[PDB]
């Protein structure tokens, strides 16, 4: 469902788009996890960021379908300490990273839970 599972600021880079490799370009992203998607915003909501979406007129930069997505530690792809690699069925791949180990850990567990429930 579209109910929000988790939201938070993470550093993110695209690694591939439709199977085409991209050079890393790390930047901060306001991230929203639902029961079926990961949604990226350029900046966090102007207020009440724990709502995930913030105001309904706030437009995301991009979104991916998590059905059949795969998660792995991102150590082969980045030297950054706490990094996760997500690959999605249309061939979009990205890394998510945080300086805070506990935050990235929670995201890894949450993403896996959402993904498993979609099987």
UniProtKB/Swiss-Prot annotation:
Changing residue 80 to A: Reduced affinity for phosphoinositides. Residues 3-116 form the PH domain. Residues 23-26, 78-80 are annotated as: Lipid binding. Predominantly expressed in peripheral blood leukocytes, spleen, and thymus. GTPase activator for the Rho-type GTPases by converting them to an inactive GDP-bound state. Has a substantial GAP activity toward CDC42 and RAC1 and less toward RHOA. Has a role in regulating adhesion of hematopoietic cells to the extracellular matrix. Binds phosphoinositides, and has the highest affinity for phosphatidylinositol 3,4,5-trisphosphate, followed by phosphatidylinositol 3,4-bisphosphate and phosphatidylinositol 4,5-bisphosphate. A region including the PH domain and partially overlapping with the Rho-GAP domain mediates interaction with phosphoinositides. Interacts with FASLG. This is Rho GTPase-activating protein 9. It comes from Homo sapiens (Human). The gene is ARHGAP9.
């Amino acid at each position: 469902s579209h109910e929000v599972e988790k939201s938070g600021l993470l550093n993110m880079t695209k690694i591939a788009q439709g199977g085409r490799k991209l050079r890393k370009n790390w930047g901060p992203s306001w991230v929203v996890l639902t029961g079926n998607s990961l949604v990226f915003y350029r900046e966090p909501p102007p207020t009440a960021p724990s709502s995930g979406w913030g105001p309904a007129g706030s437009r995301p930069e991009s979104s991916v379908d998590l059905r059949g997505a795969a998660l792995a530690h991102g150590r082969h792809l980045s030297s950054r300490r706490n990094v996760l690699h997500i690959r999605t069925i249309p061939g979009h791949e990205f890394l998510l990273q945080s300086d805070h180990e506990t935050e990235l850990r929670a995201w890894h567990r949450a993403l896996r839970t959402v993904i498993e429930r979609l099987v």
